Design a protein around this ligand. Sequence first.
Ligand SMILES: [Zn+2]
Ligand SMILES: [Zn+2]
Ligand SMILES: [Zn+2]
Ligand SMILES: [Zn+2]
Lengths: 859, 110
Amino acid sequence: RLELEAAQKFLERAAVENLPTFLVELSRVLANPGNSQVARVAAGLQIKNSLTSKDPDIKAQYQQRWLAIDANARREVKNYVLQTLGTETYRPSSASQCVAGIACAEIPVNQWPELIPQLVANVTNPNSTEHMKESTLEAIGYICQDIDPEQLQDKSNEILTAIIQGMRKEEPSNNVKLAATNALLNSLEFTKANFDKESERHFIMQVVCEATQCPDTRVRVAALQNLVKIMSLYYQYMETYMGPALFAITIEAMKSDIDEVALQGIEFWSNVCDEEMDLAIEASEAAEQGRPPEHTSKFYAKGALQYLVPILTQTLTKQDENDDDDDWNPCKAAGVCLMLLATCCEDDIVPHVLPFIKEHIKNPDWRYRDAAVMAFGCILEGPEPSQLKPLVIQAMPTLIELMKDPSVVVRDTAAWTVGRICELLPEAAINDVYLAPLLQCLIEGLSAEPRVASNVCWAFSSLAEAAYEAADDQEEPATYCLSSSFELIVQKLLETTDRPDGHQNNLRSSAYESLMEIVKNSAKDCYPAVQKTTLVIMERLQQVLQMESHIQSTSDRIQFNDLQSLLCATLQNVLRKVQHQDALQISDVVMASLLRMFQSTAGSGGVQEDALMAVSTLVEVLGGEFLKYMEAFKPFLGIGLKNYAEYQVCLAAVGLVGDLCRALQSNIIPFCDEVMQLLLENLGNENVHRSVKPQILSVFGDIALAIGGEFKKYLEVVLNTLQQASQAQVDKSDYDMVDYLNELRESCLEAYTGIVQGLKGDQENVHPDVMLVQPRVEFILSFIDHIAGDEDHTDGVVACAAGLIGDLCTAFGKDVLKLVEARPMIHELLTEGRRSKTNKAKTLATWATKELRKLKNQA
Amino acid sequence: AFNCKYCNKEYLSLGALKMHIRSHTLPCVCGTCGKAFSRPWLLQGHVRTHTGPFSCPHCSRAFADRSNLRAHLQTHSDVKKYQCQACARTFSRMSLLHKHQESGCSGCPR
Ligand SMILES: [Zn+2]
Ligand SMILES: [Zn+2]
Ligand SMILES: [Zn+2]
Ligand SMILES: [Zn+2]
């Protein structure tokens, strides 16, 4: 490091004091083949670091800083940078990155029109040396990579010829070919007009296919990578080449003993599967239920299925009794490809893979035995479950013994297959023939290696839902097929939870997910155990937080938040289904977990909304005696309301305040002052998402409805706030803003309503307090008048406008009617609500009409 | 002998029935695609994906179709794993990550 400061900032007191002078002197020591290869690259690295960055915004800002330098300085920079190509005889070169750095800034503003025709010239020139054509193709590659293809469309055919000339078989240097073939990979986007003409297309494909035959494997892989890209970009043009060329190339590639070549051949067909599944959806959806496709599938994968499958299953043998993950070898690639083929080819996949399975499931060589159970599991999704069920039956007890195989990788594959069966086709599991022995097999599996046990946890989760939905899924069933095993499965899962190697293969987290999954998916006769289990889960997840929160990685944090989020839903599940007295029993512990989930967790998260939703559930079940938790919940409710960033949390918290209003009623008064301040602040903060404001306006009514005359403190500011919100205008030719206008109107009307009702009282006649809102009645009805003549209002707005008219009649009487008949548009609105298909708008408009009638008769 | 309590649309297999029922218990809806989820955390994981229709995890680039997205990903390097931002499980290709994510985080690799 001792010579680092004298460099890594000695070259920064220049780049900020005088960046022009800096970049010019660096380019000089780059352009001269006399200085060290180290200083040369350092210079180039300094220039490149001055023009671009991984952060798209500082890149966008480093570019503007370049387009600000004196044009004579930059032209000096561009002169030495460009004149370096061919001079460097080391590494891929540093100048090529400088070319593209500058170019990505200057090209989109038409500031270096000289570059591209000059770069084409470097490759095209027959005098040009190896290093000249090589470095130039690389720069071309970097440019096409880092720039928008829309900014190169007029030079596209110049770029292409330079690349093709580098890829041609005649070119003696494979280094050039590799550089050119890599360049083509980044420039297939703007050769669209070429590929569209047949004779033009033929030549491109010829060069690429020819390049896959190059005795250099780098050129092979690169060209094979191009074929994968070409299939995605120009799928509708490969019928010509698949037969005579593309089949043989990729097929032979899959069989290569060079892993890099094999992975590209496999990726070709995996990619075809992705295209042809996406077409299978386009042909299925919108199509037929609208006009038919519109991009038809040529079914390349279906058609090659008979020569792909035997190659793949053989590749499933080529494994490591070790590997670690994520290891990406042809063996693991072959399995994923087979899976994609099954979901793409469906039933057609079955008779090609089945003779392999039935011939190797008992082979003494473990790599062949592993491959068989693996191939079996790969095809379980896609084919009809009809054809599939009597087939796992053959293999099920074989799967069960394979769980106790002497090879660790067969054991692991068997468990994945079982778990895959339990999720996709649990018929073989939830069956009187194999259920009990499979459970024993699973119970034993939790004691196995973490890689196996995690798969078992998965299988348990899938079995619990399958069992729950199977007779006899609200309302809850009295018993299910896991009832006589429930307490045993739970304690086995809890044992797994406390394993010293629980950190491996997400074992511990998977078991916690299984636990919560069986708690949710359980029958009524499991409830005493469900209740205890729920308590245990909460105590231990608390321990995990208190003891491990500070040492969790980014991935541990995503899992733990996922589990806490799951715990919330689990707690909501339990609290809604158990006897009310039992919910009271555990509600103290439930509240503690939820309160621990707030903003402490997490840095990357969090789960505040999930937790607020669980509190809402506890509020709805307890209601009034939730009051005991109100003092402890207060700060966390406050956190939710101040979370304008995560606006979804804000919404849930605001909604929760309304739920607390209906539950605690007048008991919420001690807590209203702070809540009202928070809500009011949220309104006077333009950094808040607009979707929370109407919900806040609504809750004003809920709060007023709960505390009655105590709301007088807030009347002035609230009523005036409602006045500005009611006067809102938007562009009527902006459907999003019109929908937001209606949402705001509906909440304004709701707010007025709850304030009128809340100040009125429940008894008769009206409390004097309501008279404080009377001066607003004319504006309120004037507000409804404008809504009436807007035509773009919704039936949800008409409903609330009607409900308010009915409430004003009861509160203020005769005065309301004089104001209403002076605005005949109001009666138009009430009629529209009276003649409505919306049940809420028809009742309220009728009620409002009735009340208006009484006022007239009472005159 | 299987049927959905939510809409009585009788099923013959219980795995397909299992997949059906899940679509009725999905309140958390997106706005960037209106895709649906069972938990708020799952929905949030989903929108982590949107750098904005379709986005590249590596470089944040957007494309008009999934084909050009797919072709673009071929240009990228070692990756390799696509990691779900809801459950941290990893995947070999983006099609398998998306399919996992949209089904409420179902399906474990290999
Ligand atoms: Zn249904
Ligand atoms: Zn979305
Ligand atoms: Zn990218
Ligand atoms: Zn996930």
